[PDB]
Design an enzyme around this catalytic site. Structure first.
Site, PDB file in Angstrom:
ATOM      1  N   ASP A   1       0.826  -1.206   0.000  1.00 50.16           N
ATOM      2  CA  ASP A   1       0.000   0.000   0.000  1.00 50.16           C
ATOM      3  C   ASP A   1       0.861   1.257   0.000  1.00 50.16           C
ATOM      4  OD1 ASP A   1      -2.105  -1.816   0.071  1.00 50.16           O
ATOM      5  OD2 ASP A   1      -2.543  -1.551   2.185  1.00 50.16           O
TER       6      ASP A   1
ATOM      7  N   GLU B   1      -9.048  -2.564   2.644  1.00 51.59           N
ATOM      8  CA  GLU B   1      -8.664  -2.139   3.980  1.00 51.59           C
ATOM      9  C   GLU B   1      -9.919  -1.662   4.697  1.00 51.59           C
ATOM     10  OE1 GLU B   1      -4.977  -2.159   4.908  1.00 51.59           O
ATOM     11  OE2 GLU B   1      -6.390  -2.659   6.545  1.00 51.59           O
TER      12      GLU B   1
END
Lengths: 249, 252
Positions: free
Chosen positions: A52, A162
């Site tokens: 990420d 997420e």
């Protein structure tokens, strides 16, 4: 699945992405945000060596390069080791790929151990999970103190796989902008692969990331995966909102 | 202007409040939230000696007093959060006597805060005093959430609507909480409720506007052009504080 239709609509995941189109769209948002705010001279992001922050760091640097061609801002990558950086290879590999304007290294262990020690003296003995939350919130503090010191903003790495299940409230994901919200996990890998990242950099919940990503794309998943995804989504709603008031709860 | 109507409607401040009525509504919100989350065994708030946390602490203790009379096990945990020596110790101690919290925990934040400052200094980043104050606020946030997790509780915040203009709140610092019951009050309304509850005296300036004009503006009253411009610039300049990180979908 009706309940899936609610989440699908809220998490904004596209059925598919064209890499070049999507990267262009992500840069324009980052570039438009800087351009619209006179006081932004830097963008700050911690580089964990994980996928990420690796994609978002790269997106920000590419955005910062093009902002400087259009007439002044810098990208500041932050290494945030707790003690001895043990995933040092992934971090260095991310850095070599991003080519950041500046690298700041701030070891969070002395601050974190003192927060833990101070509470222990007050009779509050943190569990290992609670100590990990202190690590994440301290990582947040380092990034915002650097953003404040360098007249910049903190960039977050939250995305939709997420957002649905995974983040410490007011911890490491808390930021001023969150550009890759809307991507699911496999979509992040696609953009990393298109950009030429080494693949070491894009390689529990009771559910796989493959089921989460499929669920976010509106695909049907097993009933058993539906309950885990759905229960994770519902139990984390407080994280997608500031504190509840009389008017939001 | 129509921007005052936009701001007024978003900040939810009532033109006037009946003191007993409003205290009742605020207490019911806190009691309803606890009642709706069976696993909440405690409520956590730092007690700074200032009006907001004094009012919020008092409201929470009254809320917990009544919850236990109705058969719900809950605790209020007031936290003293001094940086070195308690800044306004006489006000902190007077608030503590006025709230009478179930439990009082003291966590001195100075060592963690200075360690953060030192660690940054080692990386070449010399913080200003304003930045150090921000570190103090965010460490205060960390202590309260660490206590809340450890005691199976939630963190109660002190945000109100006049803070949306003054913006003394440090982003992701002390105002960050799980619930913010006095959102919708302005400053004079906080004082009214404290004075009504029998509170003693817990109730330079480069903002460019007085607190009275801010409060008047939130109540929908007209203020001078100069106050209107200063207030509106403060409202827009703090919009990012009352919302999570902007995405492609929250940033027009």
């Amino acid at each position: 699945s009706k309940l899936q239709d609610v989440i699908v609509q809220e998490m904004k995941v596209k059925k598919r992405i064209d890499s070049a189109e999507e990267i262009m769209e992500l840069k324009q948002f980052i570039k438009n945000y800087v351009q619209s705010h006179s006081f932004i001279k830097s963008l700050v992001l911690g580089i964990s060596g994980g996928q990420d922050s690796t994609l978002v760091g790269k997106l920000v640097q590419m955005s910062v390069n093009e902002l400087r061609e259009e007439g002044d801002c810098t990208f500041i990558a932050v290494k945030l080791p707790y003690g001895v950086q043990k995933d040092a290879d992934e971090v260095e590999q991310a850095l070599r790929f991003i080519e950041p304007d500046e690298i700041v290294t701030v070891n969070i262990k002395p601050a974190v151990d003192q927060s833990v020690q101070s509470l222990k003296e007050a009779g509050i003995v943190l569990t290992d999970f609670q100590k990990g939350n202190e690590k994440a919130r301290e990582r947040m503090k380092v990034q915002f103190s650097i953003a404040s010191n360098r007249q910049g903003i903190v960039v977050g790495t939250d995305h939709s796989a997420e957002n649905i299940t995974g983040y410490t409230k007011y911890g490491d994901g808390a930021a001023d902008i969150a550009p890759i919200f809307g991507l699911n996990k496999r979509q992040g890998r696609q953009l990393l692969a298109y950009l030429g990242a080494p693949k070491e950099l894009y390689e529990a919940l009771g559910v796989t990331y493959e089921a989460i990503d499929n669920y976010l794309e509106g695909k049907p998943v097993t009933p058993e995966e539906q309950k885990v995804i759905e229960n994770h989504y519902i139990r984390n709603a407080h994280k997608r909102e500031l504190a509840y008031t009389r008017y939001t709860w």
